[PDB]
RNA sequence: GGCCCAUUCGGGUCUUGUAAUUGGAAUGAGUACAAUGUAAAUACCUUAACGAGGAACAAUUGGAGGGCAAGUCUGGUGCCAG
């Protein structure tokens, strides 16, 4: 038993690289839901924050912070399913993967896709959601089709990547111990500290509005390039307050940082033991 | 667009350190006030220098010649060669080389053709002796000053060959927190085309100063002989204080010149160097710009220097000033918890700074 | 004229080439042998 | 010439429209036979073996 | 102030009398895992206790807003259409740039036709990349390195592995990855599978030094033992001076060298090749024509449009092809046939 | 708006260069260009590489007659003759 | 093949005479050559002799 | 062979002989690689020249032993592992296109 | 040999 | 023409091959009505109907060798060697 001592003491050691990310209040966790168009993802959103808040969320729309534990809150957003391009840039961005399949169909060339953008860019913690497990009488069947997309599934993300199959839903949501203990696994995950994320300072943008001036829009007739806004938890590296670094907006070009001032946390965690209902938030 | 600075000073770190920064630069009026107006000889050298080692770089001057601007591009350096001008000897260009020299794709090896030393410039063992373990202890491994040559001025004809091959990707982050004990004092005293005696003068009057101290004195002796010796005779005088406990060391030289005497240049650049070991916190203040300017192109990271309260002058906070231009970052002098020397500690904070210009 | 020059820095080149690799050639040969028949050297009296 | 030329034009354009006619019933990119069974360049083998 | 390198001190009289004594400054006379982790937790927390001082120095100006505090942000000139069709349901990722990443030039990367994109990809055909925080359409041309001597230009991306590619977009950093996509409408997103090239970028330069091999053949039509006057690869006895001594071969591996322009006719020589070459063969002199990279760069900006899918830039060479109906270029003597060899009998 | 008029800019250059994408080659950008494939005279003004077979015949300058001849100067007052020896 | 893929190890064709210098039949490749060298050859070592 | 174990874990330091012209040659497919155990700069092979493209700086490299089954013509003997594992994907499966090297 | 690999250039307009 | 032995020269022996055309039989995995089973149900068992030609209703893994170019690189006593 020594030899294998020596051979699993191999595996504990990891390249040292820098975690760069603070100590004392850390942003919250992105997590992005991607599905194929037409199976999960809104329903499953509205599901977990229903489960994390007591407080239904219809119509969601954009970026949902919720505080989900004593220390860790995170972030939801859906990707349009047949935007590639904001699937690529959630791919960059994000920390959990809710990568939704159609289990009676099969997988989709839209989660290959967010496959592979996901590891030719840093694979974030990707959770498997399996939905549509109304299949047929044949529980046989669907513990074969459980099988095979299981290991299709290990076999594109490391092996160890945990499937979590949701059967069919009753009464608009899903089953709320399923999504209890969908939720206990998302609630530890170990998120680990990539490059590009980790040497450069970003943000998923919550909030947005134009601070223009409407006499000015009549003035010059709807051709202004107007002053914009942008609310949002910074992640990564330190953004430094001076005007003027340039940022990349993800599908609109490079604009530069005319001023920035941080405000108060919108939804701040709480400063064995359990969560409050007075402690979980919405933002 | 472009960063714009008033009046030719500080010419040599502004077009360095917007190289570093990648920000284009304009440098207004220059020396607008003059008879002959416009750019120094030396300078425009500067900017071939500059246009050799970079690349995809323009540099503009103006039909009056008082203005430039500099837009930097990838420093990827190569083997080249740089015949100087006789106004200024070849410390002033293998000077700022030393800062661009670890960041680029190719390994720097350019050797310099002119006047090896003069007296308000850096001679060739200052750079070595001074400003090579600052590199080396700054994150540098493999760098030398090979001297092939050596001319006094003004006739010169002196070859030096600059050559690093460390490429690091950024410095690494100081941690100086304490006041280097010295270990010994060396010294080089050369001379091209006198007596092989002025030198042992020399270096007579540099141990009767030094001979108060129970700490080790040794100045080796290079007369320069045949053709390495340049066309003009001269000769020169470098003490070093050495600490070697950090690789810590402080500088001080002079060249003697037309009716002067070796004893006096001894016992001068002894007393110098004595009162840089005065004003003197672990870097002495021609080797404190580029190692700060190390300090700030490192990692994200806090590094710290201790400084004493005599380095401070108005060429160093003019440094700081146009650092902070450049690409926009503060120096914290944090005090000392003792108070029987003024030594503040510059922390900064180093920008996220990399070699992107290597080949992985 | 510029057969000369172009055929004398092939020449150069290619003499160049050859003297690495066999430098890394010869380097990696002998102090990385010396540690394998030092491990043999170590399992031969195991 | 013109008439060999739309000759060959009108056999490309019929390979080109017969090769995108050839979707799914839905608008539903099912997945192939590579992606799926995910067999990377392997050498030709033998019904022989396969038994 | 800082062009005098030598630091300033008092005239030589004070110092001199100063510096008789010593006495003030005698007192300065007299597993490698876990190491590693040790080191860097050792500077982490060096950074906190020298962050650890006066407050808003910190929190705006010597570092600044380190991560989850939550910020608004002023960007100016940004234009209408932005505002104009904000939907909601596309994420608005801002990121900072690094220093090189403003910068613009050729970016030489390693990259390599997805294991599941069907079609090969050809150089200077338009795809688009997503590097770093960008995406963008560019026009890549992919280059070998023929036994690492040159950087030569392949017409196509290979099947079945890594080439090179060079492209003129942003710089990133050395040894970051990309994605590159050929499609990215919805209307013809199609069956098949949309990403097709992937790799990482090896290093950057603002200028590329790549070459296509052009071969000059010519024609042999007087023939003696071991010399020949070869017909037509050049037009005259200038060009003929211009190329005189070069090594040409004929197809046979039969090698040899022009050795003089021939005065009667314009563009004849006379070369003289190892042995006796025939009439049915081609000599060939390789040389090397130097290609430009394309320095066309649009970025996607699908944020700005009504539908924000359907984002339609420059098309493949095969698409401008079918819509103007033209037939591809086919050199009637570049197809191979079946070559059926006779016996060969000498007398 | 200025994203519509960068937009005309980069439509116009899209068909520029792709009516250059698919026109026809340059003659040099083919391999195997005869002399009639191409422009008379054409690679008057072109500056390819090549390589080349020898090296050739060293042009006699008045710096190499100099080296030969205070070569011979050394040996003649140095009296080192290869010459025959008598037997 | 040890470490060499069946699509590493394609089939690359011979080309053919150009179809203008077809009355100069079989353009003729290396193997064609030394089939003609070493003919004249050992031709030539039997008439030294 | 490591010290204790029967591979080992390592980081790619530079990939050795990346000038040398001959393609598939064994200076070509030789990477340095320091381990992560015990900080030594070891050398190692690769597969081949078409999958010396998957690694290439700080790569988290497993490496094991080479055994070569007798004296080969072109050979160092004088490097003594092997590349087995890149960033936890094998890369003999990366060769033959199963998998895709994440980041 | 100088010209063949640079972009640059010192523009002198003096 | 195939095969077998042999360092060698050679010997030994015999219906054996082919991306060759073609034929009708068989039924399992599957798809599945069922009854039965049991507190109900799953599961076994019993059982109608559809179910094979690239039987594409598509098993791998490992090894031994070749061969090819108007291709590339290196060496040097032509056309060769690597
Ligand atoms: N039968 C069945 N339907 C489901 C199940 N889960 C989700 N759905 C359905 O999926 C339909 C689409 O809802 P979503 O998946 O939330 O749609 P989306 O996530 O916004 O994605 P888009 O359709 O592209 O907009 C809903 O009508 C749900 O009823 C399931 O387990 N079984
Ligand atoms: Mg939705």
Same mark, same amino acid.
């Given at each position: ?9 191999? %595996? ?102 967010? #496959? ?99 006499? #000015? ?56 033991? %359990? ?9 | ?21 990648? *920000? ?46 500099? +837009? ?6 190569g083997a080249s060669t740089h015949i ?25 090896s350019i050797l310099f053709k002119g006047?090896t ?23 540098? +491994?493999?760098?030398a000053?090979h001297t092939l040559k050596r001319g006094?001025?003004?006739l010169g004809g002196g070859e030096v060959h600059?050559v690093?091959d ?24 050369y001379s091209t085309r006198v007596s092989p005696?002025?030198?042992? +003068?020399?270096?007579?009057?540099? *141990?009767?100063?030094? *001979? ?10 290079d007369v320069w002989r045949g053709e390495n010796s340049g066309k003009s005779p ?19 030289? !002079? ?23 005065? *004003? ?25 220097? +201790? ?32 108070? !029987? ?20 | 004229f510029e057969a000369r020059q172009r055929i004398e820095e092939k020449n150069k080149e290619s003499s160049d080439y050859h003297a690495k690799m066999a430098h890394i050639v010869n380097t990696?040969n002998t ?16 | ?51 | ?39 860097? $937790? ?87 990349? $997503? ?16 036994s690492r001597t ?74 003696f033992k071991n010399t020949a006057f070869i ?6 006895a200038?060009?003929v001076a211009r190329f005189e001594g070069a090594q040409i071969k004929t197809?046979?591996g039969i090698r040899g060298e022009i050795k003089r322009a021939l005065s ?5 020589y006379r070369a003289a090749f190892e042995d006796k070459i ?5 000599v060939?002199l390789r040389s ?45 003597? $570049? ?13 | ?47 390819l590489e090549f390589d080349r077979t020898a090296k050739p015949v060293p042009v006699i300058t008045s710096e190499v007659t100099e080296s030969l001849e205070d070569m011979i100067r050394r040996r003649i007052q140095d009296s080192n003759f290869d010459d025959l020896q008598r037997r | ?33 030394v089939?003609?060298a070493q003919?004249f050859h050992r031709k030539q070592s039997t008439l030294k002799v | 062979? &490591? ?5 080992? @874990? ?9 000038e040398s012209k001959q393609?598939?040659?064994?200076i070509? =497919?030789? /990477?340095? /690689?320091?381990?992560? =155990?015990?900080? @030594?700069?070891?050398?190692? &092979? /690769? ?23 007798? @004296?080969?013509?072109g ?8 590349? /087995? ?19 | 040999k100088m010209?063949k ?10």
């Open positions: 038993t020594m030899q294998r001592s020596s051979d699993v003491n191999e %595996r504990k050691l990891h390249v040292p690289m820098v975690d760069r990310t603070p100590e004392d209040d850390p942003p919250p966790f992105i997590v992005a839901v991607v599905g194929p168009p037409g199976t999960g993802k809104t329903t499953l959103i509205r599901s977990l924050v229903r489960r994390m808040t007591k407080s239904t969320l219809n119509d969601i729309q954009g970026p949902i912070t919720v505080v989900s534990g004593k220390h860790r809150r995170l972030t939801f957003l859906e990707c349009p399913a047949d935007d590639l391009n904001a699937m690529i840039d959630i791919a960059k961005i994000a920390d959990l993967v809710l990568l939704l399949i159609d289990g009676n169909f099969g997988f989709e060339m839209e989660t290959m896709e967010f #496959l592979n953008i996901a590891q030719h860019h840093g694979m974030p913690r990707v959770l498997g959601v399996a939905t549509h497990l109304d299949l047929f009488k044949s529980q046989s069947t669907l513990r074969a089709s459980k099988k095979r997309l299981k290991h299709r599934f290990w076999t594109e993300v490391y092996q160890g990547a945990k499937l979590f199959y949701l059967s069919g839903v009753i009464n608009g949501r899903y089953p709320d111990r399923e999504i209890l203990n969908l939720s206990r696994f998302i609630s530890v995950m170990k998120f680990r500290p990539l490059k590009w994320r980790n040497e450069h300072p970003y943000m998923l943008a919550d909030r947005f509005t134009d601070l223009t001036h409407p006499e #000015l829009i009549e003035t010059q007739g709807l051709q202004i390039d107007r002053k914009v806004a942008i609310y949002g938890y910074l992640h990564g590296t330190p953004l430094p307050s001076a005007p003027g670094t340039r940022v990349h907006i993800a599908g609109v070009g490079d604009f530069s940082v005319a001023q920035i001032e941080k405000l108060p946390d919108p939804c701040p965690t709480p400063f064995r033991k %359990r969560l409050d209902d007075k402690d979980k938030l919405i933002y | 667009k472009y960063t714009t600075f008033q009046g030719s000073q500080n010419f040599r770190l502004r077009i360095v350190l917007a190289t570093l920064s990648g *920000k284009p630069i304009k440098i207004e009026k220059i020396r607008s006030g003059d008879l002959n107006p416009g750019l120094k000889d030396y300078e425009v050298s500067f900017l071939r220098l500059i246009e050799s080692v970079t690349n995809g770089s323009v540099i503009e001057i103006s039909y009056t010649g008082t203005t430039v601007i500099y +837009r930097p591009g990838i420093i990827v350096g100087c001008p006789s106004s200024k000897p070849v410390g002033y260009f293998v000077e700022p080389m030393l800062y661009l020299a670890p960041f680029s794709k190719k390994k720097f006047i030393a003069s007296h308000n410039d850096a001679g060739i063992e200052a750079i070595k002796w001074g400003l090579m373990p600052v590199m080396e202890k700054f994150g540098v +491994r493999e760098c000053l006094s001025p003004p600059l690093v460390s490429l690091i990707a950024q410095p690494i982050t100081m941690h100086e927190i304490d006041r280097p004990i010295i270990s010994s004092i060396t010294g080089v005293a005696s002025l030198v042992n +003068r020399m270096i007579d009057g540099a *141990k009767k100063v030094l *001979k108060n101290l129970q700490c080790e004195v040794n100045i080796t002796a001269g000769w020169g005088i470098t003490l070093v204080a050495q600490s070697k406990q950090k690789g810590w060391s402080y500088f001080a030289e !002079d060249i003697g010149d037309a009716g002067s005497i070796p004893e006096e240049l001894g016992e001068k650049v002894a007393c110098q160097l004595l009162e840089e070991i005065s *004003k003197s916190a672990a870097v002495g203040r021609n080797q404190l710009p580029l190692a700060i300017v190390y300090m700030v192109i490192g990692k994200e990271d806090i590094g710290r220097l +201790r400084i004493n309260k005599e380095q401070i002058d108005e060429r160093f906070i003019i440094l700081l000033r146009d650092i902070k231009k450049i690409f926009n970052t503060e120096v914290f002098l944090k005090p000392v918890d003792e108070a !029987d020397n003024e030594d503040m500690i510059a922390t900064i904070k180093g920008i996220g700074f990399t070699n992107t210009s290597k080949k992985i | 990696i102090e990385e042998g010396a540690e394998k028949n030092k491990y043999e050297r170590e399992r031969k009296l195991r | 010439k013109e008439a060999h030329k739309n000759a060959v034009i009108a056999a490309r354009e019929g390979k080109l429209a017969e090769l995108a006619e050839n979707v799914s019933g839905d608008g539903k990119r099912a997945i192939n036979y590579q992606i799926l069974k995910n067999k990377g360049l392997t050498p030709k083998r033998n019904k022989d073996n396969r038994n | 102030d800082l062009e005098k390198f030598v630091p300033y001190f008092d005239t030589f009289e004070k110092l001199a009398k100063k510096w008789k004594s010593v006495d003030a400054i005698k007192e300065r006379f007299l597993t490698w895992y876990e190491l590693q982790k040790a080191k860097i $937790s050792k500077q982490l927390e060096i950074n906190n206790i020298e962050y650890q001082e006066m407050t808003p120095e910190q929190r705006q100006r010597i570092e600044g807003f380190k991560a989850g505090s939550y910020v608004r942000i002023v960007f100016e000139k940004v234009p209408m259409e932005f505002v104009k069709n904000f939907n909601p349901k596309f994420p608005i990722v801002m990121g900072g740039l690094l220093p090189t990443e403003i910068k613009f030039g050729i970016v030489k990367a390693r990259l390599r036709r997805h294991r599941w994109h069907k079609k090969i990809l050809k150089t200077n055909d338009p795809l688009v990349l $997503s590097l770093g925080w960008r995406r963008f359409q560019t026009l890549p041309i992919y280059t070998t390195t023929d040159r950087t030569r230009m392949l017409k196509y991306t290979p099947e079945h592995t890594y080439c090179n590619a060079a492209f003129y977009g942003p710089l990133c950093s050395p040894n970051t990855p990309f994605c590159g996509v050929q499609i990215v409408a919805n209307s013809d997103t199609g069956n098949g599978f949309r990403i097709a090239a992937t790799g990482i970028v090896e290093e950057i330069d603002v200028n590329i030094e790549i070459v296509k091999k052009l071969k000059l053949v010519g024609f042999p039509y007087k023939i017909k037509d690869m050049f037009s005259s200038m060009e197809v046979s009667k006719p314009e563009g004849h025939l009439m049915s063969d081609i060939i090397w024509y130097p290609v430009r990279v394309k320095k066309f760069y649009n970025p996607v900006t699908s944020l700005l449009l009504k539908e924000k899918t359907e984002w339609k830039g420059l098309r493949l060479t095969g698409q401008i092809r079918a819509a103007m109906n033209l037939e591809t270029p086919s050199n009637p003597d $570049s197809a191979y046939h079946k070559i059926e060899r006779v016996e060969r009998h000498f007398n | 708006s200025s994203f519509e008029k960068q937009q005309i800019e980069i439509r116009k250059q899209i068909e520029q260069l792709e009516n250059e994408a698919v026109a026809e080659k340059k003659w040099s950008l083919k391999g195997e260009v005869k002399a009639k494939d191409r422009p008379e005279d054409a690679l008057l003004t072109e500056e | 093949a040890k470490l060499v893929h069946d699509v590493q190890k394609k089939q690359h064709r011979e080309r053919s005479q150009l179809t203008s210098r077809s009355r100069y039949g079989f353009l003729e490749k290396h193997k064609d050559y089939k003609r003919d | 062979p &490591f010290g204790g174990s029967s591979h080992a @874990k390592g980081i790619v330091l530079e990939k050795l002989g990346i393609p598939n040659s064994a070509r =497919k030789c /990477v340095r /690689v320091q381990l992560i =155990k015990n900080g @030594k700069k070891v050398t190692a &092979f /690769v597969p081949n020249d078409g999958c010396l493209n998957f690694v290439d700086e700080n790569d988290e490299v497993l490496l094991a032993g080479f055994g070569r089954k007798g @004296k080969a013509k050979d160092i003997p004088g490097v003594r592992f092997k590349v /087995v594992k890149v960033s936890g994907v094998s890369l003999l499966a990366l060769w033959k296109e199963k998998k895709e090297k994440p980041r | 010209m690999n640079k972009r640059g250039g010192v523009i002198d307009k003096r």
